[PDB]
């Protein structure tokens, strides 16, 4: 709101980037592994 939009300024985008990153982490909390990079295929994640 202060910046008037996510894409208005570079600093706004980075705030949006972290905003989406933190939200992105929150939406995919189960699939994340602490150390090893979790690996899955289309069938393993149920993607059709």
Partner 1 sequence: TAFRVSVNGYETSNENYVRILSEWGIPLVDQLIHDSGIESFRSGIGLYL
In the region spanning residues 1 to 48, those forming contacts with partner 1, defined by CB under 8 A, are 39-41, 44
d(CA 42, CA 48): 6
Q: Which residue has the tokens 């939406």?
A: 27
Least distance to partner 1, CB of residue 35, Å:
17
> Measured from the CB atom, is 22 or 40 closer to partner 1?
40
Least distance to partner 1, CB of residue 39, Å:
6
d(CA 47, CA 6): 31
Q: Copy the structure tokens of residue 31.
A: 């699939």
Residues near partner 1 (CB under 8 A) are 39-41, 44
């Amino acid at each position: 709101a202060e910046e008037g939009g996510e894409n208005k300024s570079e600093r706004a985008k980075q705030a949006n980037a972290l905003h989406l990153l933190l939200i992105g982490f929150e939406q995919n909390r189960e699939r994340i592994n602490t150390v090893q990079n979790s690996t899955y295929s289309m069938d393993q994640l149920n993607f059709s």
